């Protein structure tokens, strides 16, 4: 939590929702139940069961090499490809730390450069990991896409959105980023 | 149904399993009750709950392009993209029917050329067409694969086997192919 009015929610079947319109006219600092599909952390349906307006803070934009761009607030949680000691980890960032030349995650489905950056030297280094198996799995998922950001600017004061999905994860996606509720 | 004993059923996590090994010495003919995740379609967890040994049956060969191979009865269904009448769609055909030139689908997630043939001409001849975007989605997924069928041989006789997924779809990864139940 918290990101801008204008981020599209991905939804099944190639839908998407700007998080604005999902309670349209939702009041300023607003609990407000819904029932909605949206996509997970990979591009599965699940159910997201409250809107949160939460009023109007500071908002800064993450902007990615390729262009895709996402904006919420300094403690606003989007999934990064961290390197953990040699080891390619998802792991949650806060906008507030993220920086440019940091690898968030894109979930491909929320739309209808090469490779999972330092996999192969993980691989040929460690391997015979018991887990380094189960890793490579998670990485090279098709469905994911690991942008370079390039960078995090601020963009004001604004109204900001959140979404409560009913998963332990409790993550979706936002303008192909993987944001946390 | 069927499948060779050979033929690797996709689990969560990377991991597989030959099919004649979900239960070890079944006998011939037998109606087995198990507690199995398999990867589905999608590659998603899918429960299986039985696993059927059909006896011994004429078997084939399916071989693709790039090498892989899955062997079973005439009438087992593989899921292939075929063209219906200027839509790529995705539909179960029965080995018996399988011929080089045809596209099954690999779901790469069983694992741990360029692009989806036809939705170009496609899109660009329909994409308004309201479900254009819908198929657009499902074809697009990055965890497919569509392989181009070499070569269908006849294989033998042998023992033969098959899973029950408790799903609508009845669908299992064998050797990187979606099969059917």
């Not at 806060?94 to 691989?123: C, H, M, N, W």
């Given at each position: 939590?918290?990101i ?94 993220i ?33 380094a ?17 390039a ?31």
């Amino acid at each position: 939590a918290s990101i801008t009015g204008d981020a599209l929610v991905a939804l099944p079947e190639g839908e998407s929702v700007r998080i604005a319109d999902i309670v349209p006219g939702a009041r300023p600092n607003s609990d407000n139940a819904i029932d909605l599909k949206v996509l997970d952390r990979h591009g599965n349906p699940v159910l997201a069961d409250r809107l949160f307006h939460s009023g109007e803070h500071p908002v800064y934009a993450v902007r990615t090499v390729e262009g895709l761009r996402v904006t919420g607030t300094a403690n606003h949680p989007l999934l990064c490809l961290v390197d953990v000691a040699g080891v390619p980890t998802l792991l949650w960032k806060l906008i507030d730390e993220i920086k440019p030349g940091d690898y968030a995650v894109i979930q491909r489905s929320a739309f209808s450069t090469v490779g999972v950056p330092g996999l192969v030297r993980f691989l040929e280094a460690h391997h015979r990991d018991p887990d380094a198996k189960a890793i490579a799995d998670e990485l090279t998922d098709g469905r994911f896409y690991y942008a370079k950001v390039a960078s995090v600017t601020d963009a004001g004061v604004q109204p900001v959105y959140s979404l409560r999905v009913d998963t332990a994860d409790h993550a979706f996606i936002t303008n192909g980023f993987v944001s946390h509720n």
